[PDB]
Write a protein that binds this ligand. Structure first.
Ligand code: ZN
Ligand code: ZN
Lengths: 497, 497
């Protein structure tokens, strides 16, 4: 009983270390002055070392063992203890010296990448990728329960997911989305030139903050700022911050980045107050998290009802830019499709082809079938086959994404595609329970959609495993069905295909 | 050599905790959302505890003892050890229990004050101040080498400074500045109404950043943001941040807050790189620090040469506002004088009367001659006596300043006046070594003044004691001479007195 109070305080201390670490990273991406990079990284390592010591503290381990042997715990408290013991298990499996070696290597890899990408110097990154691949395999070998080292990373991203389950889902998406995208591309695109007329940055941000405020984003428990790369980060139990990036030459970039990151933040902001500061107080997996950003961005933000509700405010804010443009035309311009090179900018239909490419290259590298020095060539070859075009150099080829340069190789991307699928699966379950969602959206009323997602997804945090969470909320395990039905219906209707 | 590497690593770890603690506080004042106050305070408390442990670690103390007995250390390394041991002495002198009790109390006092001041509820703060006074005396009692507890606080602010030395400075400033201020007030004020014509906030910030940029503020090692109260804070060896406050109804506020805090930041940004991350890597005392904010704010920022250089940019930025206003009128308008209530806004001539008021009330309270419950009345009586008027309530009376509600009572304010004195003493030494500084200023060239201050003041950090630094840099100990000569000359010529 006194042991439980001590466990509660140690858990709150781990959450507090995490919030402070998140602040160091949030400030690094937003306001850190250019000449202060090195000291900030050292500050981050200092905190990483301290937090790891507490996450692996032997006394804490004994407290967990004590609470675990009790028989009088509520379902939530026992699950809280179980999750803590699972985190403790993972944290102590890997020697702290290996953790530090890996962190220093990928940190140096990153710095080399920030220069080699603009310089089209993939040959320079090869030694960095070779060591990263070796370290990635070594890290997975501390977990022999995954015979396939790729399964260790897939599981780290989405508890319980396997490479065979991922490959199956990918196979289904490719078989369905390639024809649907090709048919949309062959039909021709809606008008888009009015999006290039000049949209003032401050006006874009104000519009975005009105929308996500309607969604339910709580500005007493967060804020938004500008960054080069949008992200969401939690600095505390009541401090969930988002960032966006604005292009005056295209207002859909900032709007949908903001809706996307806001979706992540709604998830975090809906976690039950009783779980904040405990091992259950956070999102449960990468795919479930990305299902919420994608739900508010795509399923809601790009829908006809969304623009039925906001076109008026939009045209008022941008009167000259929307002159001669109908509400229907703005709805179509937000749902264009094309074969493109940059994954983060890819449309709803071709996006997953980027993830599959990266996933299959990871499979090839981790299995020893593809040497890293051949990665640049294999990447272009996969882009030609999967997207029908190739980048002019390696800048937007294998150097495009930071993941393999600032972290392990393997399991880096499937969460994006799992999130896309689950977005429609969670959304369909929400509409099954609230058939008048679209009529609400037209009134700028998202309370029932938010209410359903909070009751069935957000509040539970980590109390359920991803698979339990998905099955309880939607009645079935991960399935591509609702996702494909939504896309075929939406784009079949948009392009007459 | 092995032992020295450990000292430098521990010293850098102390500096890194300091930067992180500063980041938590900087973010708290700028961007922390409203619902995140409680969690941030616990985070700060967690970091305060860890840093305090590091600062008092017995092993660390043993390393310092070893290194102090060595005979092969350079004068700087020996001084680092001496400074580290002096910090180690005071940090361990006060029991950790007492550190937490005092810290927790002033936290509750501060929070109650943020509500009691706007409500004119001094009676509510009386118990908080009584406990603060008792704890202030108790804290000083851990340092019996100061017979007078006020001398403990005076020395904590400015090493080597005493109450008897402060009193002599006050008497001299009072004897010279009261008649000069009364004569200025009786002569009449320059035109000022054009300052009320409306100055857009964004232009004010842009202008202010161009000025301090020319001063020498390095935005690659800092930045500026908006807060309720301007301040300067060091988040790292290359991260010295400043904040300002903008009033569109009066542009002198933002401008001179920015010049003031930039002056603080210039000092920190000039500390020698060899001292960053060591016990010598920071400003040496409150008085020396405020000497630099006041030098760049008053001696430079309010001088005729400053406006000969910047009125053009000023007029171009605010053309209608400065229509019918000469460059000479803008110079006179930034140098008005009057008996006022708010210490932080008080002019060059009457400012010190606010510091003297507070110091003498501290003296009476520390000696047990003034009861805390009588402070509100004694404050008003001292304001009538020293400044010729009194506030309508306690809001701008004894509740005005945060110092006694978020920290100890005693020695809280004399550093501001010490800084005023030293600003002219340092400045005159700079002109003696660089004949013709004012001519440089008209060209927006501050490199000779800044270079002199960096070489003779900033780079040393804590390498010299305050008395040694002032003596070496200016050829004499602290003296009000240069200060009184500067004011008598400046205001004698402005007002014909
Ligand atoms: Zn996302
Ligand atoms: Zn100051």
């Amino acid at each position: 009983d006194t042991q439980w109070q001590q466990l509660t305080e140690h858990w709150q201390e781990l959450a507090d270390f995490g919030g402070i670490e998140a602040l160091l990273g949030w400030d690094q991406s937003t306001f850190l002055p250019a000449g202060a990079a090195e000291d900030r990284a050292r500050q981050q390592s200092l905190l990483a070392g301290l937090r790891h010591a507490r996450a692996t503290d032997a006394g804490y381990g004994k407290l967990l063992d004590a609470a675990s042997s009790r028989s009088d715990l509520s379902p939530e408290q026992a699950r809280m203890v179980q999750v803590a013991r699972q985190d403790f298990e993972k944290a102590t499996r890997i020697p702290a010296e290996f953790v530090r070696e890996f962190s220093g290597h990928v940190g140096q890899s990153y710095s080399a990448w920030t220069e080699a990408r603009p310089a089209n110097d993939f040959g320079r990154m090869v030694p960095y990728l070779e060591k990263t691949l070796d370290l990635s395999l070594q890290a997975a070998s501390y977990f022999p329960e995954f015979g396939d080292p790729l399964d260790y990373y897939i599981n780290e991203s989405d508890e319980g997911m396997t490479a065979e389950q991922v490959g199956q889902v990918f196979a289904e998406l490719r078989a369905a989305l390639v024809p649907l995208a090709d048919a949309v591309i062959a039909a021709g695109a809606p008008r888009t030139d009015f999006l290039g007329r000049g949209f003032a940055q401050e006006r874009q941000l104000a519009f975005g903050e009105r929308v996500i405020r309607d969604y339910g984003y709580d500005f007493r428990r967060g804020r938004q700022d500008l960054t080069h790369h949008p992200f969401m980060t939690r600095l505390g139990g009541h401090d969930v911050r988002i960032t966006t990036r604005v292009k005056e030459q295209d207002p859909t970039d900032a709007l949908y980045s903001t809706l996307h990151e806001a979706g992540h933040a709604l998830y975090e902001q809906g976690v039950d107050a009783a779980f904040l500061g405990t091992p259950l107080g956070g999102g449960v997996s990468a795919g479930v998290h990305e299902s919420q950003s994608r739900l508010w961005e795509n399923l809601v933000g790009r829908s006809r009802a969304f623009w039925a509700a906001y076109f008026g405010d939009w045209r008022d804010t941008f009167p000259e830019q929307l002159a001669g443009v109908t509400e229907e035309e703005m709805y179509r311009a937000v749902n264009t499709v094309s074969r493109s090179l940059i994954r983060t900018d890819a449309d709803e239909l071709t996006y997953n082809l980027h993830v599959i490419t990266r996933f299959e290259l990871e499979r090839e590298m981790l299995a020893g079938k593809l040497a890293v020095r051949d990665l640049a060539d294999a990447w272009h070859a996969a882009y030609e086959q999967n997207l029908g075009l190739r980048a002019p150099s390696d800048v937007d080829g294998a150097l495009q994404d930071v993941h393999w340069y600032f972290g392990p190789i393997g399991g880096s991307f499937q969460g994006y595609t799992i999130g896309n699928v689950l977005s429609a699966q969670f959304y369909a379950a929400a509409e099954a329970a609230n058939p008048g969602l679209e009529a609400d959206f037209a009134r700028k009323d998202f309370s029932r959609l938010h209410g359903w997602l909070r009751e069935n997804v957000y509040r539970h945090g980590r109390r359920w495993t991803p698979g339990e969470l998905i099955e309880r909320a939607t009645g079935q395990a991960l399935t591509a069905g609702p996702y494909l039905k939504y896309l075929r219906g939406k784009y079949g209707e948009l392009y007459g295909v």
